[PDB]
């Protein structure tokens, strides 16, 4: 043939893996105070426009994907913005004399304690009634846990904690990916792959053990690991099936405001109505037993059809590696989830604790206390699966154990920007053709 | 937009047909959603976590999407979705059938085959487009009367 | 005729009206340290290229009018970015033991109080001489009034409060238009119309129920409202003659600087030279008599011609409300200004009295507290207009009745952003013609 | 700038003699104010008020100013103030007399005119621009010697 | 990058021969720099001093590099790296000898010449560039069959 | 000729000279907590591509510089910003009971001080053991120098004072001229320049009187002035010879950390292992004269060779502008450097003295703590030059004296920004020739 001519071409639709920053998107709906909303990021969230390509198969990862990053240490920084202008608690780590309740069952508890306080005029202090609860004091007649650690400034009343669901919105130039495979395990060339311009609601939930509320499978529970085969990696699952879990407090849980020096109110929390009891949450025993089949149905797809066994969560740690740890309308819970892993191989209440001082809930440092709630709390919604930990050890070929594993925030989000990947757009092609400029 | 990446490049020569299957608008389009509101927010808030994250990002797509027209202006090719060149298909090596290309081939399979020699190119277009052509331009500056072509 | 063919015009001189931020921008006289000056945000402010356009009937509009918040909105962020890096006063909200001041003619006043502080070496504390006047302190001997409210953190003394007048230029893509009609009223086609790149000097005073140093109108005093109909609605008014205000303070005012902790001063005030008398206002009677009835004149264009009365301010309120309030050099006057209104249909002082601790001057919370001026203050300069009310009710027909309302700070600058309004500008226009392209 | 916006076409023909009315090159020598003082105060201060407020407000008339560029970029009017098309006047059915147009009738009422159907404007010029006209310009890549016009 | 700005404009023209010394590219290639690492860190920090100062720094640099496409486009020169006008070697006062010029003359020395009057010929371009041209071009709008070179 | 025509060229190699901003650039090495890496603000510090062009003599000058004040306001806010999120220690300024120490010579010294603190539940205060020296403490039995100034917060001791060099790299479109002539002075032409993208590395050191580290001219030792003619300049000189500062501080000074509230820990100096010796640093007498021969020949060059003397600096003053103040690791020494200057016409130990307390190393107001350092403290390098001052005075011909002034910090970074410029780029360049466009 004859010597062709190279032949620019401005806009082909090439892709290169990339990293770069996103956006959040959300809705309206006033009381824009929410934590994560940030007053309406951008409010937008127009027509969710999605084409698919259908004739590229695409690799993915989810364990070197650079969202989940972003995602969470905008949500560290989304955490202390707004518990910065909150009033500090550094007066109230003074000493407390304190003692037990006396109105109803054990096994519950409390401390009535009361301290110096009130500060109002810089020279007049009052005994003041306080009721705290236990894991948040320590004796010497008490102080509180966090004064050898930092300060305790609180959370302001007025902001909410319900994690309504954002949208990651990709900048000019990049694109976002996202696959289409029902059986797409973790990591792989997804064959039916489509495009967006923004994710879909992802609700920024914070639980260890168990996440709740999620992006819930297909009919196959899917198993999700970096490899199986190191016993040091955590393994996700993913549901199928919304799994209710009725949580309640029972008590009635007075209020009682603190004026402390200038204009800064204290809410501490006053003598309840007298009913107290212990809080919970009713699992369902047996759409819980049937989950558990689906799971190790799959679970020997993995290896040997052998010897399943599950444990209790790994014994030591703070609560927060052992406990399913969240919180129900800013009142954050605490329960003793043992009572769900027997040897599965061929109604359910919980004990709940509440902390009220909290640390950083990833580091350690700075604590927030929260406020009380009035009245009676209770909340349900779904499950969407665990975080699970293979132990390994001598077993060489028999009695599988499994523990409900898992730390780290990121494995939460993990388990919903997998199906999604950024890339970005180079427009700039070139090619040879039979075409040549007619030179003057 | 992005209709047929997964097509060849025969299956693709619709996508020039086409405003390059939508990817230079696309490029800018979608900057009309921080167009949108930026400043429709009505809070005080007292600081900005997305202040910088959002600027440094709203600034980053228009500097790379500067160059390219500052590359199809040093190639002569400004405004021109296509334009061939005076460089010709070079000894660059990857030298094929035509007919396995624009066929059975896709862009990023294309990208692929040079993703080598990709700078090579880039300097061996604006050789050809200034140091001898607009040269030859100003020898075009003479104007005779009655021995123009001798 | 023949098919025509569109054809492009960039460049076309269309608008839209649309939204967006402006800036400030002034001019450079050292001492930059002005509250609303920012250090001199732009200090160009070149030479003002006006441009008219004299064959356009452009509608405006001053109740919808964007600008005003964008005005409002910057003044209360300059003014915290003023009053952030200055000393806080939470320690100064102690118990005060106060008694009067005897040296001088009743009916002013002033109270002697003193306290423990000093608070120097965190160990020695010292009883403190203090002059305070009325209107900030509480009893049970005493407090400062904004102890149950928030901190009280002070004013920087370097700093001034002189309204240095800014100019609002438009940015690239942005037009300011600009009525020439002179007997605009407040909403409507406005005949001619003129361009500008930058406003004028605006001068961003502050004053409740008489505005200062304006933009005087012409000869016909004009009369400004949303709607007559509703008695709901603020009315404004401007004027065509600098009626003047001779304000003074009598006393000498001595300051007595305190050491607090560290290196943070702490200004009160000290024992006077002594001759304790009046603020006051002095105002001709003769020229204010004038002014009322042009005024009532071009109201009787309004509603029949009959029966005009004026009131004190009614309801009670605040102070804010009730009395022409506004600063004289960094001194906040508060003046009984009843004596300005009685029925007017066919040299006057006034008593001032002066707080010291102020309120932030729109919001409840946080306080600011002014430092006392040494020496004998005194001031003087125009009014342009009121705000007043028109009260209805069972007035049927007769005994038309008025009151000099107003509490809000946005009418200030309703009353110089009416001429003015911002458009974008769009510069891609087409058009059928009679060319066509030569296709090769 | 601006100095005969209020006039008819007409009387906004002689706006086309001249620069727009010197409406494009004001767009851009609005920017000089903010271009001049930036940097040259000198203060610490600690913060900015302004530091996003005029940043945010300079990269809108950017991207403003940049997608009229990129618009005429895709219609092959780049450079061009003035340019015709090959779309004719169409279907639109605001069709009326010439000298109605081009005498009496300001261009915020000529506005006012196709204010509907503009975006269907704009989506009919790079069909014609690209989608016929460029794959036109490639058929123009033959070069016979003996049989070119048959 | 300026190798050959100490030379005269007679050594300088073999910077016209080439990418006007790489001026252009230059312009344009020092942004890779904080191209390349403005997201790289990994820092949390609270706080930034350089989230303005580089700011501010970056679109100093996209501004002014639009104002020269922008007045390029206006003297019909967008694309073009040289071209010459319509617009003559006028009355400007400061005429001489070419060869005087285009031997021995450095382009600081050559600025130094037309320092004054060069805002005189940047207004004049635009003159026969628009207010003459681009209406002689709506003159080649008539398309007769019979009576054309009248 | 024929008449020409104007001919554009776009990128034509001129520049004029301008003013903008520039932006740090340095290498990756973890303990990125840098007090001016600010964790390395732009970590890639590429190849140092340097041009010539040879044909172009370019003016420079070293004392209308720029960038000497973007190098100093920069020092200054990565100096606070660091600063800011420390422990303050105001509760520290309190009464302080203090004795001396007894355990080895005397010539040294120290005051063992108690007070009442640790104020850790607000409500428990101890008396706490203390170590701390002269010269920031004074009496009434004792407190601290800065408690009649403002607050005095200090370091975290996690960062570092080691000063990294750096590089000034230019935005787009400018250019950074550097000129090669080993003989330039201070100011004038420079015949043999060059231009680079990025500055060479630069160590940030804060040292009065004696620059260290610096950048070695060539063997003409430099002289460096603004003018010799007045006497009020400052004159620098610069080194060819890398003489040897042997620096060390004899002491184990044990560290003792202290509880302050909440989460804030103090670091007090322990009672330390016994061996109280005297700060000293030794410099060899031999070359240290061979130095001053070098200069005194090339001061001669300025004026008439004859009587060459020098001297200490004067009596009274400060310590800053008085003795070669310094950190060695994070510990700020104060040597009285008399012992270097008599008259030079024709080993050596050094007292130095430690502060801890450091005032703001340019301003009064606030003031930062050092936390003592563990071990023994030695380290050694270069100097590169000396900040000197003419007397002048009635000296009409004879006995020329100079002192070793100095108490600016400009002048250190004017000793290596010197060889250095930044110029605009003006790409737009117009040119008469014999083409002319084909007008159809
Ligand atoms: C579980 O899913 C629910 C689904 O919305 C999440 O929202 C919670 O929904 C319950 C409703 O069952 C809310 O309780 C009550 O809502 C009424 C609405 O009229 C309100 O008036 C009451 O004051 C009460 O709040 C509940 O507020 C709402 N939010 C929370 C934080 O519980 C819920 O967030 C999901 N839980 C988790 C742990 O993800
Ligand atoms: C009323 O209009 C005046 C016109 O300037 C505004 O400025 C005030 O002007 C007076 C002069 O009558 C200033 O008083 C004295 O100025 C001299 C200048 O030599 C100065 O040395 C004295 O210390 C004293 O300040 C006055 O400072 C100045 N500013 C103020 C705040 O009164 C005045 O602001 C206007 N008043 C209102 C309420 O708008
Ligand atoms: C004088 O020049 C030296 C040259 O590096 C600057 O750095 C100092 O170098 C000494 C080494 O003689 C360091 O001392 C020791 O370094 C070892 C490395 O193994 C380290 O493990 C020890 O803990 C000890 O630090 C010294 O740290 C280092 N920095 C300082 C601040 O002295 C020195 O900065 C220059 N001095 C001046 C005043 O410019
Ligand atoms: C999950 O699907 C992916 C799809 O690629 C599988 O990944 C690879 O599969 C091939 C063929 O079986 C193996 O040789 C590779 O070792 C796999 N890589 C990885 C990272 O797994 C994968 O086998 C599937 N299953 C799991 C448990 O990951
Ligand atoms: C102020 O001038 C405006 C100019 O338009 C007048 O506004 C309208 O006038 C027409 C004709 O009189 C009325 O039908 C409308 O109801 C007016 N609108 C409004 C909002 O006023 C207006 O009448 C003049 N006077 C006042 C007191 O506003
Ligand atoms: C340093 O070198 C510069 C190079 O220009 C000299 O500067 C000028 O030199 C001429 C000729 O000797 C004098 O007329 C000027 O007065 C000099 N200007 C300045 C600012 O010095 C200079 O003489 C050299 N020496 C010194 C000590 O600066
Ligand atoms: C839980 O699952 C149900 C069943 O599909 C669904 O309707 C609901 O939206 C889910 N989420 C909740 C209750 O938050
Ligand atoms: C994918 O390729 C097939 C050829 O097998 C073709 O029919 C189809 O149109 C292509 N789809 C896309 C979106 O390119
Ligand atoms: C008040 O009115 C007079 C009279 O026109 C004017 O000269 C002066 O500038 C006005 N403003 C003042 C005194 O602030
Ligand atoms: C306005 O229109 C009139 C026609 O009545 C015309 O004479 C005048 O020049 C026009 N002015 C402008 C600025 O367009
Ligand atoms: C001091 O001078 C020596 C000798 O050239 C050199 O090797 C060293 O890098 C210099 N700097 C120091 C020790 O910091």
Chains 1, 3, 6 share one sequence.
Not at chain 1, 293 to 299: I, S
Not at chain 1, 366 to 377: N, S
Not at chain 2, 4 to 28: C, D, E, P, Y
């Amino acid at each position: 043939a004859e010597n062709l001519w190279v032949t620019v071409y401005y806009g082909v639709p090439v892709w290169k893996d990339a990293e770069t920053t996103l956006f959040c998107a959300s809705d309206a709906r006033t009381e824009k105070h929410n934590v994560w909303a940030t007053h309406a990021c951008v409010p937008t969230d127009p027509n969710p426009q999605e084409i698919h390509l259908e004739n590229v198969t695409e690799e993915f990862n989810m364990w070197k994907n650079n969202m989940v990053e972003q995602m969470h240490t905008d949500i560290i920084s989304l955490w202390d913005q707004s518990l910065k202008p909150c009033v500090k608690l550094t007066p109230l780590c003074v000493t407390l004399q304190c003692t037990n309740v006396t109105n109803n069952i054990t096994d519950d508890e409390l401390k009535n304690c009361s301290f110096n306080m009130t500060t109002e005029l810089r020279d007049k202090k009052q005994k003041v009634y306080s009721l705290f609860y236990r894991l948040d004091v320590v004796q010497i007649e008490y102080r509180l846990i966090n004064c050898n650690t930092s300060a305790i400034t609180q959370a302001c009343p007025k902001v909410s904690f319900e994690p309504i669901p954002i949208h990651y919105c990709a900048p000019a130039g990049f694109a976002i990916l996202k696959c289409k495979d029902k059986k797409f395990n973790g990591t792989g060339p997804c064959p039916s792959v489509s495009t967006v311009q923004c994710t879909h609601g992802i609700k920024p939930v914070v639980s260890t053990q168990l996440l709740l509320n999620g992006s819930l499978a297909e009919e196959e529970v899917m198993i999700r690991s970096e490899n199986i085969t190191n016993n040091a990696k955590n393994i996700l699952v993913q549901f199928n099936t919304p799994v209710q879990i009725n949580c309640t407090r029972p008590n009635n849980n007075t209020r009682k405001s603190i004026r402390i020096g200038p204009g800064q109110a204290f809410y501490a929390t006053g003598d309840i109505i007298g009913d107290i009891r212990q809080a919970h949450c009713n699992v369902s025993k047996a759409t819980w037993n049937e989950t558990l089949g689906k799971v190790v149905k799959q679970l020997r797809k993995h290896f040997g059809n052998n010897t399943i066994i599950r444990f209790a969560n790994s014994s030591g740690g703070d609560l927060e590696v052992t406990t399913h740890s969240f919180n129900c309308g800013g009142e954050f819970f605490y329960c003793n989830t043992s009572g769900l892993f027997n040897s599965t191989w061929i109604s359910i209440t919980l004990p709940c604790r509440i902390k009220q001082i909290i640390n950083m809930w990833q580091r350690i440092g700075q604590a927030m206390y929260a406020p009380p709630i009035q009245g009676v709390i209770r909340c349900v919604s779904n499950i969407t699966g665990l975080i699970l930990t293979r132990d390994g050890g001598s077993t060489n070929s028999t009695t599988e154990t499994f523990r409900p594993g898992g730390g780290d925030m990121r494995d939460n989000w993990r388990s919903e920007l997998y199906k999604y990947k950024v890339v970005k757009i180079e427009p700039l092609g070139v090619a040879p053709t039979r075409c040549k400029r007619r030179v003057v | 937009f992005l209709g047929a990446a997964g097509s060849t490049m025969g299956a693709a020569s619709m996508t020039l047909t086409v405003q390059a299957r939508n990817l230079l608008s696309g490029i800018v389009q979608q900057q009309s959603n921080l167009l949108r509101a930026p400043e429709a927010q009505q809070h005080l808030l007292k600081l900005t976590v997305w202040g910088i994250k959002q600027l440094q990002a709203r600034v980053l797509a228009v500097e790379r999407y500067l160059r390219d027209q500052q590359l199809l202006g040093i190639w002569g090719c400004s405004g021109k979705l296509i334009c061939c060149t005076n460089v010709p298909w070079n000894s660059s090596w990857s030298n094929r059938n035509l007919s396995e290309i624009w066929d059975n081939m896709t862009w990023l399979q294309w990208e692929k085959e040079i993703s080598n020699y990709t700078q090579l190119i880039y300097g061996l277009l604006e050789e050809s487009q200034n140091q001898q052509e607009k040269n030859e331009q100003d020898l075009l500056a003479l104007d005779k009367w009655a021995s123009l072509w001798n």
